Structures are given as C-alpha cells and as structure tokens.
Amino acid sequence: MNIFEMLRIDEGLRLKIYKDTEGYYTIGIGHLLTKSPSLNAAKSELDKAIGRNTNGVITKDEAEKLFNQDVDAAVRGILRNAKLKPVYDSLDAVRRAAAINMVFQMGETGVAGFTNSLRMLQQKRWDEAAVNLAKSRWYNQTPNRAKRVITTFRTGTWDAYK
C-alpha cells in the first residue's frame, strides 16, 4: 500500500466526466475540473489539463498522468504551507499518506478548519486526534472514506485499506 493505491481506492477511476460527492464535475482518479455547474466549462478545463480537444473522455494513461500531477501538487502544497509543514514533517510515512489524502480531497480551503486535529496529530495523541477528526462536515458527508483515513491516523497502519 502507498498514497497512490490509497487514493485510487478512495477516488475510483472513471474515464468520462462525472460529478463528485459534492456534485462537481470531475474526471479520472478524482481530478476536480471545476465547481462551475456548466458542463462546457468543465470540458474546457479538461481540454486545458490534457492539452487536446477531449470532448469529455480521456484514456487510462491520461487519467493516471493527471493523478500523479495532483498527488505531487498536494504534497508540494503541504510543504509550502507554514501551518501544515511542521505537522506533516512530524509524521511517519503512513500517516503522511493520510495527510495527503485529506489535502487531495478538500484542498487547503478544507484543511484550514482542522487546526485542532493537526495539533493533536503533532502531539501524537492518536486516539484524541481520531475523535477530533470525526467532528467534521468531512466525516459526516463522507463517513466511510473518513473512517479509513482516520484509522490510518489512529494506528499508523494500512489496516483500513487491506
């Protein structure tokens, strides 16, 4: 198991434009295209991302290309953030994957609300952190995924992903 296999499980793989859990146009392995309700706007974002006129369909290779870029971008974003970098650096590699997973899903807009969780994670108060993480819109809207990510933070194992 690793961050790629982990996010592949959590995001799935779809080669045509679909709406994510929040109703936003998405493609591939959870590559958010736009929050705009316009399918045409979404198709434009896709074409821009892939570098060709796609008409809303991509290949597995192209999906994997975007995915690698997205994971890379998520990690790079963590390291460039003053409030995130020290917590990330404090973690072991398994829990770092759990951090990347959350950033991938919600971005730094969504991660901003998790200040108290981050503090408990840096303190290595794993059970307390796990309890705090669940007290969130995130947990309530995507409980099965959140439970997997939280278990990963609680245990520092891949048990929730087999």
Ligand SMILES: Fc1c(F)c(F)c(I)c(F)c1F
């Ligand atoms: F740096 C970090 C993040 F950006 C993050 F989202 C989470 I959840 C973390 F647990 C973390 F350590």
